[model samples]
Target: LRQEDFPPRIVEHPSDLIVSKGEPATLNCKAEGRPTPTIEWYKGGERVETDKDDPRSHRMLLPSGSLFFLRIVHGRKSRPDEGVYVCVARNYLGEAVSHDASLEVAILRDDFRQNPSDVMVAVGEPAVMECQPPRGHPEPTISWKKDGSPLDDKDERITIRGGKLMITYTRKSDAGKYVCVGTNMVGERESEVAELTVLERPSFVKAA
Candidate 1:
């Protein structure tokens, strides 16, 4: 092998892999060798074949033989795009691929309604209704209301705490539609009408 007949080798690849829905994502590849190396990027097993003038695709090469950048804009990385991405580098000797990298883009689950089933309890017993919002960066505020009327601290029997509705010393008359409201920095969400039914024990009739 001659001194100038060495193949290009990948020294380092981008350790960070991040992507958001309806946003731009970047993948970087780095290489080192006797001759300057050319970088090629592929997404979802498809060769990114298109005119360089296309606004959606972009690439950049760095001097250190240490940085190759690929920018994809307005890229909606849906479920189909969740796969292996390959970065290939080529020189006079041959071509090499970086470690196959996997990317997963998930839809943010923001369902407000945690549990929306009817609750059953004794007529004269206390009934508890629980509502938990989806976990988020900023915790959501939870409140409870009955029949569209807000239950405040002044109400001795009704209380809202820790994202749950507590009804103390409940009665049959208290049965009605209960709503749970959850709000966060991103947005606010409300649960469906929760019907609370109070049941009474049946008495046996004496024989005549």
Candidate 2:
């Protein structure tokens, strides 16, 4: 004669997630019913194994039916935990299945799509270098280095935006080897070396 006599119902469903390798993640789900329903998670129509099934498992089923990953299992040859997931709540009356939620593992490639090319400019003129980082899961950040040292952004003449390095006023001291650095949570990648040669400005008239 009370609310605890009916079948399970899902009140909250899980959402898609993207996480870096070896990081913790959670697929949340909450259920409501007269009799507390047992929570079970499934992936691609197969039951998901948790700590209850394996003492050393990284997956854990939370009290509210959420799927918790102590750390996403991923490697060069084996990636077991990246895929669609569903949470099922079951009781004597019936069972309720949650909406699908996809889990993606972050990755970064080695090869750069576009590398900076050698640039030449005259002193007091503008210089520009463009680069494109390697493809990645979460997208990588762009940075620049000169002579194996990180570029100084504090300089008024230096401006970096949208994978482009711009120098408004070139100087003789700007001659050096430049490198484009691409970075992400996974790691950092260095693009092929490019040399920036700043030549002295030529005078309009010949000297006597």
Candidate 3:
């Protein structure tokens, strides 16, 4: 490396990326500076890294300064990369940023996802079942159902918000199979069932 006061200059900037949740996505950027600025990828002000904990998670900071996501999950509601992705080249002299681009994730299919867990709660306690919809062209509508019955959402004990089914003061009667469903103009999909288990504490204690 040679000492130089030159700042980073981006010659080839990244292009807008349109990708699916279950596929790979890539953005390219090229820069050159006297100090040989290193490229750093950012999304929503957070630094992006490669080889995340998930073995399948593939984020690569290429030697050529290109950013690649081997697997993209166009999550619903809380999806990352929702905003502009900036490519930064940093050197001792200065830094440069790439043009803002759209990292749109269009869903060719609707899929529901969430932690596969039994909604376990003590009687009179609060419990929640989360349901997330895939990123589709038209924002998908998320809803909750029980045994194929439309959720009233009016019961003071139960409510639906932000892709979750919240239940308060759960009772034995509340124990049932619940599902999260997503729909768009394209089609509709349902998530795996989450069984609610509301346990009642015995009124009287018996000898063990």
In TM-score terms, which candidate is top?
A: 2
lDDT of 1 by residue, 1-208 (tens): 5576568788776444545434445555677666677766666667654334354534343444332335333232324444577777888888888877766442333676476567877656778888886554346777777788876778788777786777777678888998777665545667788998776644211210
Candidate 1 lDDT: 0.63
Model 3 lDDT per residue over 1-208, tens place: 6654688999998888777666777888999997789788778778876654335546877788887776776664656644578899998889999898778766635444563357667778788888787656777888878878978776888888887788888888888888777777656777788898777665312211
At residue 108, candidate 3 shows an lDDT of 39
TM-score of each: 0.48, 0.64, 0.50
In model 2, which range of ten residues has the least summed lDDT? 199-208
Compare the candidates by lDDT and give the number of the best one. Answer: 2
Clashing pairs in 1: none
Per-residue accuracy of model 2 over 1-208 as CA lDDT, tens digit each: 6433888899999999989887999999999886788899988999999999998999998887889999988876898999999999988898999899999999887889999998878778899999999987779989999999999789999999998999987888898999999998889999999998887655312210
Estimate the lDDT of model 3.
0.75
Tell how far residue 63 is off in model 1, in angstroms: 9.1
Stretches off by above 4 angstroms in model 1 are 1-5, 16-18, 49-53, 57-80, 109-208
* Angstrom error at residue 193, model 2: 7.0
Off by over 4 Å in 2: 1-4, 109-135, 139-143, 148-174, 184-208
